[PDB]
Amino acid sequence: LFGQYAADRNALSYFLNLPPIPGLSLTGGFEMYAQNKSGKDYDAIQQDV
Amino acid sequence: SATIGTYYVNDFPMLGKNFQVNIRALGDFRNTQDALKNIYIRSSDNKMI
Incomplete structure (x- = not known):
């Protein structure tokens, strides 16, 4: 499937096999949240991120 | 309530x-017992009473 859709065209396609365990991540990728307290606009938050 | 008391209109x-928005009269006017005299209200005939 990846070979078929190598050309982006107008869509971004990611093909994944379903998780072996629902609600779990095999890679262990951390989930990190950076909380803004001053109240900066989301554009500035995205720039900093 | 708005003049003598504190009236919380919205946030x-x-x-x-979100923080409150409060309407109140200047403390000098609410001090005296006869604060009602200074306060005014508009009748249905658009006359201040």
């Missing part, structure tokens, strides 16, 4: 969280 945004 306004500051530092992300």
Whole structure:
């Protein structure tokens, strides 16, 4: 499937096999949240991120 | 309530969280017992009473 859709065209396609365990991540990728307290606009938050 | 007391109309945004908006008369006017004399209200005939 990846070979078929190598050309982006107008869509971004990611093909994944379903998780072996629902609600779990095999890679262990951390989930990190950076909380803004001053109240900066989301554009500035995205720039900093 | 608005002149003598505190009237919480709605909320306004500051530092992300919502904070109250309160209407009250200047403390000097509410001090005396005869504060009612200074206060005014408009009848249905658009006359101040």
